[PDB]
Design an enzyme around this catalytic site. Structure first.
Site: not given
Ligand code: HEM
Ligand SMILES: Cc1cc(N)nc(C[C@H]2CNC[C@H]2OCCNCc2ccco2)c1
Ligand code: HEM
Ligand SMILES: Cc1cc(N)nc(C[C@H]2CNC[C@H]2OCCNCc2ccco2)c1
Ligand SMILES: C[C@H](O)[C@H](O)[C@H]1CNc2nc(N)[nH]c(=O)c2N1
Ligand SMILES: C[C@H](O)[C@H](O)[C@H]1CNc2nc(N)[nH]c(=O)c2N1
Ligand SMILES: [Zn+2]
Lengths: 411, 407
Positions: A108, A111, A280, A285
């Protein structure tokens, strides 16, 4: 021990000690790095150590380590585990745990915001209708008419693994995908299988390119049930370009609320299998991944066609040109409609500041470079040039199998 | 023990068995991934020699043959007697080609079997090294029609008689710090440029001065040489649409030629082994031109395009980035100097991976390096899981000589 990371752009060197508190395994060994691999029922025996470790972290964070309150809470949890085989978190512990799972999420980039998270405690929920109500409230709260607020809703923890709460949707809001007999796809190709499940469960599909999917919700290990999120709760943004007036006629839109609903939250050895969370968007993305992945909306050709770019050779960089214009469109559209979004330059710069602060105050910041670096314009962001250490801390967010693969159908 | 890699765009899954032949260590543990870190006796030498000769004899389908047993014996006798050994020409060629095949950070390995190997093991002096290198440079350049090559100087002995090319690449541009406080030319090369000057170089003090070669033979003090300018093919950078682009005064050299690495073959160490191929456009247009600590030209170009530089969200950097990279490719193409774009090179690398999985059981690859520094997810390598591990023969980094050398 001490580990150093260097930023090759600034020569700033940071020292990690926090990796010493890492318990979970990475997937790597001294002979193989699995850094680009996407995806690399507890007994009392394993549970008390996990609880103890968590409560020690919690009590240190409030500057009460080894206090009477700390000691009494250890004893109380201990007794609960031996007698009931599990335990319940206090509200304060749940909040701390959910904030920390985000703080520890190495994939993420967002953070810097970790300490500002609205936690909705949904542990008194018993039915899918109850889950629907909780999720609507979260969507409305988080959306806040475009002024997005981070939030998470936490449903009851796993017991015997036969009674799991699960949101079957991968994200709370996504568009349907429909495989046509001719092999083309209408809507989002990523959501075809899930759309098919919804249809089989009784969903009446409008069969357009941007149909918001129904929620498919499972409570207490029961068969999941369908619900339509009230459309007035689903904020959407029509996509237009500041200079290109034909861009609107591509008919594109996207939803404003990114909300992941298929992950598992582990806190102190307890497993929350339904814990939808939302923040947000970062523009890429949508503009890079959702729109331009070959296996997603795949709009690159049609955009570059409209731009009259030279498409006969890849070396004209037509794809790269159309890519930038689409991402300009996404950011312009969200900003014009006053829906919170961040560009990849801003988000990565903030992440580097967050990471530096974390090293100073926490001793480290686990970070997965493969994920943190944006999917366009990588090296003109500061994160490309930042060495990162990836390790796993708890509390944490984890992947879990898709529920249609494991669910025992009751009928 | 058997490992799967999946491509998330195409669903193609490959099975890797090659990693089990992996020799060296990654820097990662079960507790920590160091995937994004840039730089993480007689007794020792015989297993290394044996491992290598086994794979060689296997490759020519003569594994376990008398000639195999005879060579293993002959090398064993030579090590027991001399403390080192010498490679046959065939072994040297095989080893060099395989060090490239094994280079996990190289996207261009589809080309690995077409490598011209120049055996410079008879070299004794810096003038000799200079001669070899000019010949390499001219051969590789081939008037714009680039050919991959490596030149291999004598192997390490006691480690007090090292051959080294002090330059990081055979052809680079000088960098100078100004009384102003800014940097003229390439800021990456300031320290090397000063070392050149300290040893006598006639620095013209311009923005694009081809550095002199600084060559060390047999562990002696290094000496300066100017590469004949007619041997250094350079390209003026212009844009197919923007008539103002040329006025920036940009140029680059056609020959990418890394000269500071160590080639390890069968436990033997070749500390001077300059090698060269041809450019992928992004290396110049994204990295050389746009890194903040490099020529850092984004701001100037964006200004000339009259973009809104007030806010990051107009994506002015991204727009200019694309134009700079179109210009690099257009220029090289127009002057018939071999270049590959990142779409083409990454598509080729995917095909190469599949070949290696099919024919060899795997392909070590470092995703962090293989994915281009722009437009990552629109290239197929972004969606390709890769396993990174270290096979030998290999290219390795080594300490910069000015830190090691005693004058
Ligand atoms: C506040 C604005 C936030 C932004 C701009 C942001 C941004 C991102 C982005 C760009 C990714 C990669 C997504 C992808 O490529 O699939 C991500 C992944 C992730 N974020 Fe955030 N995030 C935000 C908030 C949060 C919140 C509120 C949480 C949980 C409380 C969170 C937890 C995670 C986790 C666990 C991943 C890994 C997801 C995965 O493995 O698919 N994020 N974040
Ligand atoms: C809380 C949050 C905020 C944010 N900006 N972006 C995200 C991730 C969302 C919004 N765009 C892609 C999606 O993530 C899908 C889960 N990650 C990809 C994935 C698929 C299988 C294993 O990992 C989550
Ligand atoms: C023929 C065309 C070639 C192309 C298009 C190509 C492509 C590339 C690229 C883009 C890089 C990354 C460099 C960086 O970002 O600093 C690289 C690295 C590398 N390549 Fe190649 N390559 C080619 C030929 C060769 C040859 C002939 C060899 C050796 C015989 C070689 C061995 C290596 C090694 C060892 C690295 C890693 C260097 C380092 O760690 O700094 N490549 N390659
Ligand atoms: C043989 C070859 C072909 C090619 N296309 N590109 C290269 C790499 C050259 C041309 N552009 C960057 C430079 O490599 C510098 C060494 N790698 C970066 C580095 C710096 C410090 C440690 O690793 C080499
Ligand atoms: C194979 C590779 O790990 C995979 O495509 C990853 C690369 N980096 C990523 N980074 C982000 N933020 N999101 C992703 O889905 C991916 N996909
Ligand atoms: C810190 C990080 O590993 C570093 O910036 C890397 C990232 N990927 C790279 N990839 C290539 N091809 N070349 C590089 O110099 C780098 N630099
Ligand atoms: Zn690793």
């Amino acid at each position: 021990r001490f580990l150093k990371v260097k930023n090759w752009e600034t020569d700033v060197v940071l020292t990690d000690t926090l990796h010493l508190k890492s318990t979970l395994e990475t997937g790597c060994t001294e002979h193989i790095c699995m850094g680009s691999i996407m995806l690399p029922v507890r007994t009392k025996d394993q549970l008390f150590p996990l609880a103890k470790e968590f409560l020690d972290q919690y009590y240190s964070s409030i500057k009460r380590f080894g206090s009477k309150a700390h000691m009494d809470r250890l004893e109380e949890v201990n007794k609960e585990i031996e007698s009931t085989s599990t335990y319940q978190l206090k509200d304060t512990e749940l909040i701390y745990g959910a904030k920390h799972a985000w703080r520890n999420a190495s994939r993420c980039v967002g953070r810097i915001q970790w300490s500002k998270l609205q936690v909705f405690d949904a542990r008194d929920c018993t039915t899918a209708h109850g889950m629907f109500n909780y999720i609507c409230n979260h969507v409305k709260y988080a959306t806040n008419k475009g002024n997005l607020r981070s939030a998470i809703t936490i449903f009851p923890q796993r017991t015997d693994g036969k009674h799991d709460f699960r949101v079957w949707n991968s994200q709370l809001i996504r568009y349907a995908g429909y495989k046509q007999p001719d092999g083309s796809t209408l809507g989002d190709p990523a959501n075809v299988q899930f759309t098919e499940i919804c249809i089989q469960q009784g969903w009446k599909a409008p069969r357009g390119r941007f149909d918001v999917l129904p929620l498919l919700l499972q409570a207490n290990g029961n068969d999941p049930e369908l619900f339509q999120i009230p459309p007035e709760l689903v904020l959407e943004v029509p996509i237009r370009h500041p200079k290109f007036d034909w861009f609107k006629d591509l008919g594109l839109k996207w939803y404003g609320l990114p909300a992941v609903s298929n992950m598992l939250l582990e806190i102190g050895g307890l497993e929350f299998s339904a814990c939808p969370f939302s923040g947000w968007y970062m523009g890429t993305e949508i503009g890079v991944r959702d729109y331009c992945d070959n296996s997603r909306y795949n709009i690159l050709e049609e955009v570059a066609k409209k731009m009259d770019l030279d498409m006969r050779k890849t070396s004209s960089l037509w794809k790269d040109q159309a890519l930038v214009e689409i991402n300009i469109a996404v950011l312009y559209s969200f900003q014009s409609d006053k829906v919170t979004i961040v560009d990849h330059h801003s988000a990565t710069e903030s992440f580097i500041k967050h990471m530096e602060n974390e090293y100073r105050c926490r001793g480290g910041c686990p970070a997965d470079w493969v994920w943190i670096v944006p999917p366009m314009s990588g090296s003109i962001t500061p994160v490309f040039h930042q060495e990162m250490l990836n390790y796993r801390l708890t509390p944490s967010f984890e992947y879990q199998p898709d529920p249609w693969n494991t669910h025992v159908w009751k009928g």
